[PDB]
Amino acid sequence: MRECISVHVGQAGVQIGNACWELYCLEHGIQPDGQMPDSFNTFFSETGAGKHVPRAVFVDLEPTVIDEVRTGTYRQLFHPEQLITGKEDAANNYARGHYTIGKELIDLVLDRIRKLADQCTGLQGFLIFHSFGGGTGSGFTSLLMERLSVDYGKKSKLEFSIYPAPQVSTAVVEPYNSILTTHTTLEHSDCAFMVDNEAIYDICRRNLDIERPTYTNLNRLIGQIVSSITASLRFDGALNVDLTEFQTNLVPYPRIHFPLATYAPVISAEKAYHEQLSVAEITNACFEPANQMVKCDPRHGKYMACCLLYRGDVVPKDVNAAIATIKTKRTIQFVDWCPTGFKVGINYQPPTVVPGGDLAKVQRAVCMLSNTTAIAEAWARLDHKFDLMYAKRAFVHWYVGEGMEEGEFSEAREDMAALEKDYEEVGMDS
Amino acid sequence: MRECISVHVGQAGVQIGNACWELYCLEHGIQPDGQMPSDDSFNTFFSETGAGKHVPRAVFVDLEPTVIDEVRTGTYRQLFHPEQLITGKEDAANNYARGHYTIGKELIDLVLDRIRKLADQCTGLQGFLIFHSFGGGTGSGFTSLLMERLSVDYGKKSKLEFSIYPAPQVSTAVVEPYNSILTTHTTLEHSDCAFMVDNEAIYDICRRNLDIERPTYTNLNRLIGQIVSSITASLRFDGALNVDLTEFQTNLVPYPRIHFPLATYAPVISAEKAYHEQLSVAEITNACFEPANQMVKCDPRHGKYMACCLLYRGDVVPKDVNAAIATIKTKRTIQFVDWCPTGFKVGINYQPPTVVPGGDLAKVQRAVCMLSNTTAIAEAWARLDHKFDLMYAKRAFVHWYVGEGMEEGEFSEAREDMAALEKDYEEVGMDSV
Amino acid sequence: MREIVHLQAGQCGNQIGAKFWEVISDEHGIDPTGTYHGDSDLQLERINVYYNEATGGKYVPRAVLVDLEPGTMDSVRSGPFGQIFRPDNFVFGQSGAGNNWAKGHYTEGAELVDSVLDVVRKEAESCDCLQGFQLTHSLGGGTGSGMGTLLISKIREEYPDRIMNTFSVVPSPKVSDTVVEPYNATLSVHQLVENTDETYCIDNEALYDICFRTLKLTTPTYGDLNHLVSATMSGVTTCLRFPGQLNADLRKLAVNMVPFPRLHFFMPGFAPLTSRGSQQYRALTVPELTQQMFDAKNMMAACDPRHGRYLTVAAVFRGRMSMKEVDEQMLNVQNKNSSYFVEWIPNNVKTAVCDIPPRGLKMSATFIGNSTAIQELFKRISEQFTAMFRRKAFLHWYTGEGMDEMEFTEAESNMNDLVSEYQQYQDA
Amino acid sequence: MREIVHLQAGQCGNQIGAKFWEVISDEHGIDPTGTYHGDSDLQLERINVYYNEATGGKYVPRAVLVDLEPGTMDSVRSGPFGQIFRPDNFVFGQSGAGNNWAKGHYTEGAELVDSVLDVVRKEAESCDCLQGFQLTHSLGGGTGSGMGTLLISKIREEYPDRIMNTFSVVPSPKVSDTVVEPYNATLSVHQLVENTDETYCIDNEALYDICFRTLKLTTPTYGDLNHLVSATMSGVTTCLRFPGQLNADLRKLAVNMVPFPRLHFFMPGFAPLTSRGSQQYRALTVPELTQQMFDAKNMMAACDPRHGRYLTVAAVFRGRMSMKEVDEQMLNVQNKNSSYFVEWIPNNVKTAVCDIPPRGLKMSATFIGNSTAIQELFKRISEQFTAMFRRKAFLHWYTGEGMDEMEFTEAESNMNDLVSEYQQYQDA
Amino acid sequence: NKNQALESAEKKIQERKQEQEDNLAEISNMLRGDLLSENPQQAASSFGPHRVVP
Numbered sequence A: 001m002r003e004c005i006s007v008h009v010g011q012a013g014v015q016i017g018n019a020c021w022e023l024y025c026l027e028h029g030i031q032p033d034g035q036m037p038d039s040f041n042t043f044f045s046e047t048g049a050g051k052h053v054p055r056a057v058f059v060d061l062e063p064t065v066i067d068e069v070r071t072g073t074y075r076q077l078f079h080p081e082q083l084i085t086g087k088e089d090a091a092n093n094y095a096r097g098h099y100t101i102g103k104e105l106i107d108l109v110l111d112r113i114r115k116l117a118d119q120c121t122g123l124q125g126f127l128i129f130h131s132f133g134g135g136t137g138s139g140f141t142s143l144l145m146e147r148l149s150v151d152y153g154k155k156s157k158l159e160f161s162i163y164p165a166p167q168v169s170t171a172v173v174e175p176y177n178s179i180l181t182t183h184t185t186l187e188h189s190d191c192a193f194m195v196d197n198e199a200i201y202d203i204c205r206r207n208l209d210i211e212r213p214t215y216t217n218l219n220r221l222i223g224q225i226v227s228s229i230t231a232s233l234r235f236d237g238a239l240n241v242d243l244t245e246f247q248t249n250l251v252p253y254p255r256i257h258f259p260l261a262t263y264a265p266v267i268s269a270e271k272a273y274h275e276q277l278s279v280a281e282i283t284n285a286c287f288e289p290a291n292q293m294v295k296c297d298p299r300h301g302k303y304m305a306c307c308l309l310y311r312g313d314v315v316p317k318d319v320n321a322a323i324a325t326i327k328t329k330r331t332i333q334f335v336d337w338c339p340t341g342f343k344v345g346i347n348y349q350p351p352t353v354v355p356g357g358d359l360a361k362v363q364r365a366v367c368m369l370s371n372t373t374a375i376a377e378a379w380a381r382l383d384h385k386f387d388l389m390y391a392k393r394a395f396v397h398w399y400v401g402e403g404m405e406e407g408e409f410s411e412a413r414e415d416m417a418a419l420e421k422d423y424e425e426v427g428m429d430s
Numbered sequence B: 001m002r003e004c005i006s007v008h009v010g011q012a013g014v015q016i017g018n019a020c021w022e023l024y025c026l027e028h029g030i031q032p033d034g035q036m037p038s039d040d041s042f043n044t045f046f047s048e049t050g051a052g053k054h055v056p057r058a059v060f061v062d063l064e065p066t067v068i069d070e071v072r073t074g075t076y077r078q079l080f081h082p083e084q085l086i087t088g089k090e091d092a093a094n095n096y097a098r099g100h101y102t103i104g105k106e107l108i109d110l111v112l113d114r115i116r117k118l119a120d121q122c123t124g125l126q127g128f129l130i131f132h133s134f135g136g137g138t139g140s141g142f143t144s145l146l147m148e149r150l151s152v153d154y155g156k157k158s159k160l161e162f163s164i165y166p167a168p169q170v171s172t173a174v175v176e177p178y179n180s181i182l183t184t185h186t187t188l189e190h191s192d193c194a195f196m197v198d199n200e201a202i203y204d205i206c207r208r209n210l211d212i213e214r215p216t217y218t219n220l221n222r223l224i225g226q227i228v229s230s231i232t233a234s235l236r237f238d239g240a241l242n243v244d245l246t247e248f249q250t251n252l253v254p255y256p257r258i259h260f261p262l263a264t265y266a267p268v269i270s271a272e273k274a275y276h277e278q279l280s281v282a283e284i285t286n287a288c289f290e291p292a293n294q295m296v297k298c299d300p301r302h303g304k305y306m307a308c309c310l311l312y313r314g315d316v317v318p319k320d321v322n323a324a325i326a327t328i329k330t331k332r333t334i335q336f337v338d339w340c341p342t343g344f345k346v347g348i349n350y351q352p353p354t355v356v357p358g359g360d361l362a363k364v365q366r367a368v369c370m371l372s373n374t375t376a377i378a379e380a381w382a383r384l385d386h387k388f389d390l391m392y393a394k395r396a397f398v399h400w401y402v403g404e405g406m407e408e409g410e411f412s413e414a415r416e417d418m419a420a421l422e423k424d425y426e427e428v429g430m431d432s433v
Numbered sequence C, D: 001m002r003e004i005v006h007l008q009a010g011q012c013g014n015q016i017g018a019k020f021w022e023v024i025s026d027e028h029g030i031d032p033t034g035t036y037h038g039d040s041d042l043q044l045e046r047i048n049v050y051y052n053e054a055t056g057g058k059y060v061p062r063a064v065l066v067d068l069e070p071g072t073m074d075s076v077r078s079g080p081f082g083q084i085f086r087p088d089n090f091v092f093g094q095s096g097a098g099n100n101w102a103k104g105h106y107t108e109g110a111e112l113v114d115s116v117l118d119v120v121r122k123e124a125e126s127c128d129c130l131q132g133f134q135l136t137h138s139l140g141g142g143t144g145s146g147m148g149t150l151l152i153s154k155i156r157e158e159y160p161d162r163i164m165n166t167f168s169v170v171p172s173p174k175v176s177d178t179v180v181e182p183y184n185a186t187l188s189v190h191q192l193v194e195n196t197d198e199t200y201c202i203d204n205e206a207l208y209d210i211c212f213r214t215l216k217l218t219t220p221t222y223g224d225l226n227h228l229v230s231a232t233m234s235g236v237t238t239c240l241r242f243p244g245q246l247n248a249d250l251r252k253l254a255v256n257m258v259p260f261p262r263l264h265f266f267m268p269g270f271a272p273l274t275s276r277g278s279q280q281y282r283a284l285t286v287p288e289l290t291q292q293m294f295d296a297k298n299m300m301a302a303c304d305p306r307h308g309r310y311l312t313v314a315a316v317f318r319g320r321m322s323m324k325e326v327d328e329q330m331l332n333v334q335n336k337n338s339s340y341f342v343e344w345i346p347n348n349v350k351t352a353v354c355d356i357p358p359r360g361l362k363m364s365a366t367f368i369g370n371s372t373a374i375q376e377l378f379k380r381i382s383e384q385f386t387a388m389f390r391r392k393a394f395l396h397w398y399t400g401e402g403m404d405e406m407e408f409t410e411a412e413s414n415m416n417d418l419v420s421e422y423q424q425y426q427d428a
Numbered sequence E: 001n002k003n004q005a006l007e008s009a010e011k012k013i014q015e016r017k018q019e020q021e022d023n024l025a026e027i028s029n030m031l032r033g034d035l036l037s038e039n040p041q042q043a044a045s046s047f048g049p050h051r052v053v054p
């Protein structure tokens, strides 16, 4: 009817999938077993019986992350094959994931993805979750995206990705692994939602009170954001918004397609019962420069767009009053060629709680995919970082020997250069 | 009224027929003694006597008694007629000359006497099903001699072949390319439709589609047994769109020398996997045309699809079949020839296949078997010709053949005739402009 | 209905065959007096290949006992299974060959060969359909090398269409028993290359090396050497004794292993051979069986396979197991070691599997290899022949017994022709 | 299914492996004999990375213990976990090198490499995906220094991509067990710069320090020092064995710690090392373990990292802990100490969080740090070699073992090259 | 399809335990097999304890 295949790539992806599909299960009441004790159709298919197998393809070159799922609590939910793993990892090297170690799993994946697209009568588009700083998540993702465009045609190939953090950086080759992936995905991705980690760390400490958070808490929040990008596709709402719509009302010029996400009523239970979270309250917070998902200060750019997705009990009148207020304050500035500015999508289903989560059952919530130009600061930091290394030809042997020319690096940084120019041109006001 | 005499020749033919007749016995409720515990649909395979016995309409022939005497001392001792199981004393020893000229010519009079006894017993005979292997001596020599004797005695009666074509890499014999080229050249025009399977593909099917690791020949013969049951399901069971055995030579082989379609069985999945997915008609139709679900080890995208015959079993809807094949034809991944715009034979049956106790298959509501005649089988012949002349250039192993009553010039006659077949496929594989 | 007549000559042939009939009787469940106290009916189903019926459920082997010395018959009767053989099949001479090929072939074995042949036709023609013969002897001795080759010629002029098998024990220089053994070996390979349909070359020093480092025995006697040979004979002919999921008897092995009628000298080996201390360190799987099968260290010949190319390879297996696992392993050994197999044969390895393992074993396998590298076995014997023939070392023992100089010359000439013919097919 | 063949070479190596294997066995749960007497499930999930599997639940270690004199290996067998090792992986020689790189790399080491390479293959053959090999050895000896380098070379060729780490024990800055250390080591380093993916450099000097100022141990035995090398060992292979929040691998660690190829010489170090009395007064918190792993004293090499710039850093934290902390306690380092980390590499630290904690511990970590301080080690080994080669001292010993004099200078050059690279980057 | 999966899982466990039973009988038949034991009893002959086997 209106289904959406979800292709998670890499540890980040596999682990994000775990949180996301757990929420999906406790929303459509599908117990870990896979049964309920047509809103589910979008994400969950169905055997002749009541076994609702998910519509996902968890793929990871390393045989470990997907193995914790194969033998876990949600073991009999996922189909044994959907979980596609390899024998050795991409060793934080785009090359291996896009040329050598990743050129032997692409077949299995595109085959299975086709098998989940033959049961789809209204495939809105594919959701591709991954992290730019990793090998598979950069290499294979780029690989898949290429053949995804040629096989599944022009579909809403959206991508909830994890951009490297301003300061913190798991791997040292992150600059490289993340520039060599934009260059190829720039023309094979519709909306690349950027959600960092150091921002979510800050939220888990300031908004929720969980000090010393783990990737679990961070991943749980990511799931609530993905639940809201796909809540009008499953549940019902006054103003429903489909995946196809976002691309139109968020991506202004083609290349510029890196929106930033934001939740809203992220409060601890002890705080929940101390504030009357109003539609304005949740909206005002969804714009504050400390609840953002990337540490790019939005008070430096111009909201080239905005898509506010209200979920829960949200009277249609308040959403207007709130947006009107935002429009008043001059801090929140929008580019001149966007006089309209916002896109609203109301969904009646209230946000759900996870047995052992962090946020407290709210009555209303808002998620805002915003295309600010303040994301330029991100690539500018990354560009220097890459430049600080390519100059010394550091870690270049780890790529030239894995089916890749040195020329590619330069070619990629020229595309990175172009995007950084475009993001500036679309800023210069009339 | 719908009978067919099934000849099982060679060890591959006999051991396949053990799983075939086990499946036939479980389908019609005939115990290994031959007596039903408590209809007339068994007549196509069994012949009821005056008492409650139901002897099969089959002959088991092999030159080596170490396989048939297992049947003569096994669970199905009392099912088979003693005269119907015919053995010699020395095997053909992977010699086509021994299976055709010296040793196999001894046993051809008793087998044809037993075949004509079964044919005189039959009232509605349709064709002969012969199970053998291209890589053996008895399965290549005595099979070939049987075709010459069946053509001279029975005429244009239908003859279907279920042969183990030689795998591209795995082989259990060294002179296996010699027998494969020799038996094909002399069966090119004494055979009507020869269905192809390879051992490597079933090994891959058992590894990736079934959950079982370390597969044996027992799992191979059961999955082949499911195909022949699916081929002959329309004669025994009620069907919405019935398919005969005289059908297969009409809608699969377009030209007289090309009669090697590719058999496959798409819904081959284990029980744990079957719980995790449905088995709808569109899902089982497009699983036939997958290159990973082929029961002949050759890539179907390398060549051109010429004729396809799809047989459906179970609660299958003809509309769902019409929708599934239409989505196959609009797919550009596989392509048909221009001179055959139809390229599809449809068969619908109502009874789902019976699960055998101990089998690796699952209880399925729908089943499909596709017999596809492809141009992509030409790369198998070219590779088989490459193996033949690699030893024929130095006359390797030819002294075992010339020393057993067969002329040396037949090697230079079979390969020249096979080289014609190589670019008979090239001739039919081009579009006309 | 496929009988095998066993022949054995010499002290080495009698002692190997005495252990051979002991292993067969343990597999077929036959006590030393000759009655079947076994368990499975699958044991007493094809007993007719080796044994013959006697009154009262008694089974006598179809073997003839041939030697020129009466001292070997006392040795074979002193064994645990010495009473199973028929006394009419004991054909023993009065004067020994004395490590003389001329005495074993011309003057002393000429009157005993008629008595042996009467017993051979006695056992051959009581079979409804005889498959072939089987001879165990040593090429370094006098009785085995001389009369053994004489029996090869005289039973092939009467049974030409039957297969001929000989389990030859060729000499090796580093373990030297007799000084005149290069003379005996050179005069006997010509009778092997022209008559025997298939032959196996057994090296004593490879058996000692296997018994030293693979089985790790403190004091390996000859009975341990004969046990390794006897397990290979059982592994070769286990197809026509027990059922298998896909079979290969003696003739089908000979067809697929011999590409040209002068190329039939094999390189035997036995797979499941582990030491006592390493019994608990192994996992009884097909990959270990195949990995130890193709090892030159496990080989029962003193010529290293890495020095030549495998023309063809046979693999006869015993036990209940999978076929994909076996079929993939022979695919793996061909693909990785592609330089060790000849290019003009694309499928060098054949496979036989029987579902019944030997008693006390769950799995077993035997290795048969026709390799070019056996030409260095003959080339090292020929260089020890031309070193003695040039100075006419021990030739007055042979010349005075009725043979000429040209017989030694034509024996070396046919022997060098075989080695050069092996060399040409390695070049390809 | 990644697997690691452990080649322990030399006396030092055979004792290092004896404790390394005991330690990994205690984690996986394998007992002295080899049966899983453990209290978990993940202890047997990924055991294929280090142990094979026999019958009965015996998990034989995938290891080859090599030596030019049986002594130390016979001593290893008669020990605690001395019956796990397969009895056919103890390849040994009969004439030792005698602190002579030459004998070990050209004379007697070169008559054993063949035998070792066989065992090596067999273990690497039965490997779905051999992630790589691992050589624990000493650089101031003969079988460890010579046959070790010989093996690393022949292996590196036969097996390309496969990772090839080496836990090498380099000479001390103070006292010297072997007088010929200068030559031995200098002649070996050259090879460890060409045929090693990632070489870890442990110096006995550091062990004493971390076993006197950190472990308050008054009577340390080489075994207490060997337990430390064994802890660092597991740390670099804990994510390919037990699950984790952020997973790592030998190859991944190499990619994010080897900037330019030549530089593969790292510096290891543990984390929750604490004294007996100073055990109850601790606070196992990521904050604490990250104040030791970086503390120069807790290094396992002589090079002090205050005289050099860390080109990279690799922390492998084994312990269910707060990801935020791991991260927050990483920036702090790169920030606070800002002159001890190069600027040409933005982020100079790799992080991995394996969950299953070290036995009898809540949170541990293994740090591997490529530092331009390592130039100190080779500078010392070179200033020694210089003094010796100048007066051509014990050159004779090396010369007449199949060696020359130019190879010595070649080596010295090769060393001065690596030390130049190091300095260049340090000042770059 | 569920009872087949439970039957197949129990069959594989039963085949694994039956594999370990004849693996232990494999080893136990080697340590007493008149070849690896090297007992001085193969030298016994039918002619008597004095004559032994040559």
Ligand SMILES: Nc1nc2c(ncn2[C@@H]2O[C@H](COP(=O)(O)OP(=O)(O)OP(=O)(O)O)[C@@H](O)[C@H]2O)c(=O)[nH]1
Residues within 6 Å of the ligand: A009, A010, A011, A012, A013, A015, A016, A060, A061, A062, A089, A090, A091, A092, A093, A131, A133, A134, A135, A136, A137, A162, A170, A171, A195, A196, A197, A200, A215, A216, A218, A219, A222, D246, D247, D252
């Ligand atoms: N925000 C967030 N990020 C995560 C989470 N889990 C993993 N990550 C990210 O994943 C990255 C590491 O994953 P990868 O390097 O791709 O590991 P991998 O998928 O095995 O890739 P390879 O090792 O190269 O094969 C880190 O940078 C994390 O930021 C999560 O739950 N939330």
Ligand SMILES: Nc1nc2c(ncn2[C@@H]2O[C@H](COP(=O)(O)OP(=O)(O)OP(=O)(O)O)[C@@H](O)[C@H]2O)c(=O)[nH]1
Residues within 6 Å of the ligand: B009, B010, B011, B012, B015, B016, B062, B064, B091, B092, B093, B094, B095, B133, B134, B135, B136, B137, B138, B139, B140, B164, B171, B172, B173, B176, B199, B217, B220, B221, C245, C246, C247, C248, C252
């Ligand atoms: N389907 C199937 N094929 C088999 C089986 N056993 C062997 N084969 C195949 O059959 C080919 C040879 O046939 P054989 O089984 O040896 O029987 P044959 O054709 O009579 O040949 P011989 O009896 O050995 O002279 C081999 O190449 C195998 O690929 C089996 O049990 N089932």
Ligand SMILES: Nc1nc2c(ncn2[C@@H]2O[C@H](COP(=O)(O)OP(=O)(O)O)[C@@H](O)[C@H]2O)c(=O)[nH]1
Residues within 6 Å of the ligand: C009, C010, C011, C012, C015, C016, C097, C098, C099, C138, C140, C141, C142, C143, C144, C145, C169, C171, C176, C177, C178, C204, C207, C222, C223, C225, C226
């Ligand atoms: N394998 C094996 N070889 C043996 C045995 N007995 C003797 N030989 C070999 O046979 C050779 C001597 O043969 P010989 O007894 O003189 O043969 P004969 O003259 O024909 O009886 C020696 O080189 C031995 O190595 C045995 O029991 N087993």
Ligand SMILES: Nc1nc2c(ncn2[C@@H]2O[C@H](COP(=O)(O)OP(=O)(O)O)[C@@H](O)[C@H]2O)c(=O)[nH]1
Residues within 6 Å of the ligand: D009, D010, D011, D012, D013, D015, D016, D099, D138, D139, D140, D141, D142, D143, D144, D145, D169, D177, D178, D204, D207, D222, D223, D225, D226, D229
């Ligand atoms: N850490 C540690 N070092 C050791 C051990 N045993 C020996 N060594 C070192 O090994 C060096 C000597 O290497 P050597 O004994 O000559 O090895 P060889 O080549 O096998 O003879 C000495 O400098 C010791 O410091 C041990 O158990 N632990």
Ligand SMILES: [Mg+2]
Residues within 6 Å of the ligand: B010, B011, B064, B091, C247
């Ligand atoms: Mg047969």
